[PDB]
Design a binder for this molecule. Structure first.
Ligand SMILES: Nc1ncnc2c1ncn2[C@@H]1O[C@H](COP(=O)(O)OP(=O)(O)OP(O)(O)=S)[C@@H](O)[C@H]1O
Ligand SMILES: [Mg+2]
Lengths: 180, 297
């Protein structure tokens, strides 16, 4: 039942938005760096998060804007982060993590939005509008759509059913990436 | 994926967000159900499809429809499901009669509760149980489908919607504004569906929130604070309105079916349709009601 959960109390997280926003950003960097070192439509749908130009809003500040204009609860940014986890990570026969795919900063910016709106759409019986958010991200609502389906397509073969363990694994998988 | 992978066939139905066609896998020769979701670049990807997709790679049970694949073509998302021959409405319509024999009912309800018990075991609420969303096939299997309104419970969620569950199948406490329903909501639906199967007729054919409550109380009596003290908490609850005692359920039903409604059946039905959310049987304990005795060891 989902490798990235193999080793977490099936019981098993009281975190604040700052704590939440922290881990996400964290995981990104780690993934960006650790990357260096199963079908076509999958990769096909992944070409999207890759913007050629340089993200006008610094990655960190960029999320600051969104939490302001959207003011989410910690949950959002946690789930958001697991998608990244589940998208890129997986354990091996010895419960040792491994890299599924290579994550680049050229793809990071759009991947951020994808995970968050997608995340909220998993959580809330009511989210912001498609243009309220398409706005918050300086994104064409046509791309926004393409970036929901892109992510969704890429991770759908993983267990995305939201639950406290998956919520927990966000922060934990972070630790297991560092050292000490 | 791969669009060319499936040959589209006859329309099998539609709902609010999707259109379903029979489909044929060109390779394996096996038939499927092609749930097509419109993807207008202006409105966005429907939360329903997202919930449906996530909640299906994890909810695997013989009484829950299987999702096989998810294809993304031009402005369209196709969720490929296992193919079922009917839904409960059509099936009953195709017999139009129109209520079912009591061994069929017991057998379909049993399977409803089995699939349901699994959802709840996994902290998942269906929130849209109604005959159109219960698929039946030739072997006679019944499977919950249409998990678009589904939601995981136990977790901190901010936004609210007491506007879930198609009206005829929505619980009184919800109608009155309860934003803290758990599994009791699905159970009420099962109670309605059970009635409908027995008589062939919907139990509470309301045309609006208020007419729905009126219909419920006409039969279940008005809310009785002695039996449901927390009722006073609900925003659309009104104490002043005129009392109204429950009717004898066996009597409101028996007319519409030639089959004799015994004690277990009626009891079992009262357990599902309890006005007080907390008093309604759980799926698990419904499964063990004596009415299902012949199904056991
Ligand atoms: N696997 C299947 N096999 C055969 N028929 C199906 C299948 N899935 C759906 N249908 C039919 O298509 C109809 C619509 O499918 P749903 O998945 O219920 O779409 P929906 O728009 O979410 O429905 P709602 O929300 O109840 S109005 C169903 O009521 C069934 O009659
Ligand atoms: Mg339907």
């Amino acid at each position: 039942e989902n490798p990235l959960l193999h080793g977490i109390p099936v019981d098993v997280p009281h975190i604040s938005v700052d704590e939440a926003l922290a881990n996400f950003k964290e995981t990104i960097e780690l993934l960006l760096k650790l990357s260096g070192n199963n079908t076509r439509v999958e990769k096909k749908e992944y070409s999207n998060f890759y913007m050629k130009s340089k993200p006008t809003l610094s990655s960190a500040d960029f999320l600051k804007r969104i939490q302001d204009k959207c003011e989410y609860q910690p949950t959002v940014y946690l789930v958001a982060t697991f998608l990244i986890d589940t998208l890129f990570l997986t354990r091996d026969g010895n419960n040792i993590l491994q890299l599924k795919l290579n994550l680049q900063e050229k793809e990071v910016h759009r991947m951020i939005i994808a995970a968050v709106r997608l995340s909220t759409k998993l959580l809330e019986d009511f989210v912001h509008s498609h243009e309220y958010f398409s706005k918050v991200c300086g994104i064409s609502k046509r791309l926004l759509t393409k970036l929901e389906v892109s992510l969704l397509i890429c991770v759908c073969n993983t267990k995305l059913m939201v639950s406290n363990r998956k919520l927990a694994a966000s922060k934990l998988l972070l630790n297991e990436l560092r050292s000490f | 994926s791969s669009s060319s992978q499936f040959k589209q066939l006859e329309k099998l139905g539609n709902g609010t967000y999707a259109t379903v066609y029979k489909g044929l896998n060109k390779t394996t020769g096996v038939y499927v159900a092609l749930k097509e979701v419109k993807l207008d670049s202006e409105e966005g990807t429907p939360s329903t499809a997202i919930r449906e997709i996530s909640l299906m790679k994890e909810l695997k049970h013989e009484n829950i429809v299987r999702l096989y694949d998810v294809i993304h073509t031009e402005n369209k998302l196709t969720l490929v499901f296992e193919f079922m021959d009917n839904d409960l409405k059509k099936y009953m319509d195709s017999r139009t009669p129109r209520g079912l024999e009591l061994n069929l009912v017991k057998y379909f309800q049993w399977q409803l509760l089995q699939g349901l018990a699994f959802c709840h075991e996994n902290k998942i609420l269906h929130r849209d149980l109604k005959p159109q969303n219960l698929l039946i096939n030739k072997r006679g299997q019944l499977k919950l489908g249409d998990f678009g309104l589904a939601r995981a419970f136990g977790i901190p969620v901010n936004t609210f919607s007491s506007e879930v569950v198609t009206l005829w199948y929505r619980a009184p406490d919800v109608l009155m504004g309860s934003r803290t329903y758990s599994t009791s909501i699905d159970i009420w639906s099962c109670g309605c569906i059970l009635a409908e199967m027995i008589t062939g007729k919907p139990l509470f054919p309301g045309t609006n929130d208020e007419e729905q409550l009126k219909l419920i109380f006409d039969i279940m009596g008005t809310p009785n604070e002695s039996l449901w003290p927390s009722v006073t908490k609900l925003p659309k609850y009104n104490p002043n309105i005129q009392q109204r005692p429950p009717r004898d359920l066996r009597q409101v039903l028996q007319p519409h079916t030639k089959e004799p409604l015994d004690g277990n059946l009626m009891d079992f039905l009262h357990g599902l349709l309890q006005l007080n959310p907390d008093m309604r049987l759980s799926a698990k304990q419904a499964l063990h009601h004596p009415w299902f005795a012949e199904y056991y060891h």
